[PDB]
Design an enzyme around this catalytic site. Sequence first.
Site, PDB file in Angstrom:
ATOM      1  CG  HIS B 223      -1.736  -1.229   1.370  1.00 38.48           C
ATOM      2  ND1 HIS B 223      -2.463  -1.767   0.331  1.00 38.48           N
ATOM      3  CD2 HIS B 223      -1.964  -2.025   2.443  1.00 38.48           C
ATOM      4  CE1 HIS B 223      -3.094  -2.851   0.753  1.00 38.48           C
ATOM      5  NE2 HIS B 223      -2.814  -3.023   2.036  1.00 38.48           N
ATOM      6  CD  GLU B 227      -1.066   7.349  -2.340  1.00 37.42           C
ATOM      7  OE1 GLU B 227      -2.135   6.682  -2.236  1.00 37.42           O
ATOM      8  OE2 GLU B 227      -0.966   8.379  -3.047  1.00 37.42           O
ATOM      9  CE  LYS B 230      -1.914   8.176  -6.593  1.00 40.85           C
ATOM     10  NZ  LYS B 230      -3.041   8.798  -5.852  1.00 40.85           N
ATOM     11  CG  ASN B 231       1.281  10.117  -4.856  1.00 36.43           C
ATOM     12  OD1 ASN B 231       1.321  10.062  -3.628  1.00 36.43           O
ATOM     13  ND2 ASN B 231       0.147  10.027  -5.540  1.00 36.43           N
TER      14      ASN B 231
END
Lengths: 374, 341, 79
Positions: B223, B227, B230-231
């Site tokens: 997770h 995240e 992703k960013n």
Amino acid sequence: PKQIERYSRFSPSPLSIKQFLDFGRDNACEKTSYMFLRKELPVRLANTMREVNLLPDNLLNRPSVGLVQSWYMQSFLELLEYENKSPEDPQVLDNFLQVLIKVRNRHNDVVPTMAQGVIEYKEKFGFDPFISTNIQYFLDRFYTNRISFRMLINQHTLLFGGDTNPVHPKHIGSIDPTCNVADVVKDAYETAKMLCEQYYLVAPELEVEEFNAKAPDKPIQVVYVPSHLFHMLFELFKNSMRATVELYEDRKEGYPAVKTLVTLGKEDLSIKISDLGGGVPLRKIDRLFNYAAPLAGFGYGLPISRLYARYFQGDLKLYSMEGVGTDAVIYLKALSSESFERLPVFNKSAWRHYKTTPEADDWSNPSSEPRDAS
Amino acid sequence: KQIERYSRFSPSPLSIKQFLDFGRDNACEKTSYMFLRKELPVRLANTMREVNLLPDNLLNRPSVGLVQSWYMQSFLELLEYENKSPEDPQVLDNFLQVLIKVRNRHNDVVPTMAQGVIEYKEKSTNIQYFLDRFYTNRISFRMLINQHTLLFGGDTNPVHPKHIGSIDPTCNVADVVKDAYETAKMLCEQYYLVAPELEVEEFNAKAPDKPIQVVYVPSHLFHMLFELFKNSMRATVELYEDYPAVKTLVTLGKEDLSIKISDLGGGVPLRKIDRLFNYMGLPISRLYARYFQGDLKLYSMEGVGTDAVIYLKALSSESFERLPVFNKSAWRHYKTADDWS
Amino acid sequence: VLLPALSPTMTMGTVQRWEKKVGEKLSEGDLLAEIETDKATIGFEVQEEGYLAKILVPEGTRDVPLGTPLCIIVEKEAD
Ligand SMILES: *C(=O)CCCC[C@@H](S)CCS
């Protein structure tokens, strides 16, 4: 303490870097300056003397502390003796100038004595938690105020003491309007290198990269006090050079360069000094800013170094990957218009920290000997 | 009064080593039952006291009512096993079903609490404090309940057999990285039809030959990396209109397990970076890291790029849960500043 | 003041540290001591109003069973 009670209840007045500059450059009026300082200096003094006054009785009792207080007090009153003298006769103004000189010297050795009173208290009274987080709180503010105090005096003496042959001819007081960050970096480095050189006969080369987002090729300059900056950089370079040598000393690869990267963005001027000294566990990184090998306590120390940075709305932060290296970063506001002085005020909000009893932890805490599952 | 009783109890922290040992050697469903039936309602009590110290114009809110009852619901349902006997297998089967029910009631895939703080669009971030503890506790809820269900669920075909519950005792981090990235890249390709490449490098200070492994809960780590990855891509792509790889470095030393992800996505001003953690996504990822005494830091060079770093304790023995206790201290944060210009 | 059940399953703790001085006033909530059961290290908070009359289990005493008289409180402060 009656006047001290009154002045302390005033709030300091922070000035943006822009303000120091535009003042010694556009106005240059010694009337306004004396007008502001005859109030502002004894204010900041009373807002400090008030805090030290709330220290634990064991600490407050160190001869080094009562000594400090008295120097502060005196300077306070010599200054307080102008609350009504007018800036009209150049006789007053000329004599204010002199007082500033006096107190600057008088206080010159406050930091030395202070550090002495704290140590003499550590190794004489107690290792506990809350008492020690307190002293930390006190010193950041104590020193920052001090830093600000000299900043104000230096600007007045340099601006109006008119010393015929000015050491720095383009500068406005201590402020460099056109400061080349890359330049202050190479010097900070050159000198940490010379030291390294003498005590290790060896030293990691330097590497510099600039990236100006603002204007992709114009070198990165800023409005700042060159010396403050130089000191933060030196501190960091000193540390990265120590760590590097110590690790590659028994290897056979020479010495990895210490890389620096300066960047200028819309609102951040950032400078990063990277080294491969082996990194440090997160756990001890934090400790670093608190108050089988040795060799070179020369600079200002990380704590003070960071006060300097935070002082003008900037910051210094350390990131490390234990096992490899470390990234030390200085953050400075790109715009002087946003670079305001960051001062400690003595109000009840401050009052609370020197008047708190130990408490329970907000979060969980493990046993020192937990029950074995099974 | 029930709540009052459970709230004065202090949360009991467990380390990854305790979690690994119990389900590897013991694996006694009877015991776990006994533990969870007391611990869970204790953890549920402490979060419920704080939620009730919330300024009424918020406690007020529709979404929040929904939550306060939901916790209440779970608290009670779990308390009927206060003094039921594990001896009859049926008690354990139902209990196992209750866990599955509360685990879903308090999932964070369906943001309720968060949206309750949006209604506040009508009408000084002391709210930050509460949510960080609120969410931290639900990370633990799931941790405790997944362990039980994974171990005693009766799934005769675990996806990872050599796992102990949700703990991978030889977690090859590099692989969890590729997974986090490969799924991110996929979510990317879907709107940009090609994402920045991934460059990875490890350095096992502890034994430079061996690939870096560690006792950890892979899903948690996933997770966090998802995240970030992703960013890092969103930024890299959004800037470079029409790509610079995303670089990752994994390091392992005596105490730390560090995972750094860097992008050349133009960076962010220091000022804003902080605001990336108050709830004004990235805040949960960090709660995940801090949950087992680790941490997640962000640092940028505004104008160039970003460095996100994850720090995990390299020893299961030092990876303890860090739980939100409700006491006077906790209480003070709900009744109350600056002594700096 | 009896040593209570700070966690469900607890049976005995250990007085890690005393955070209130014999004579000091005790307001409902003040951290009273540090008790380290085998589950966690807990900060024990004051329950009734009062003044610390005297302590019965010295700082550092280990494995103190439940119900053990920790220390005595007294209403008014002339005792
Ligand atoms: C105290 O009860 C000791 C804890 C051991 C059991 C834990 S590891 C349960 C796993 S959910």
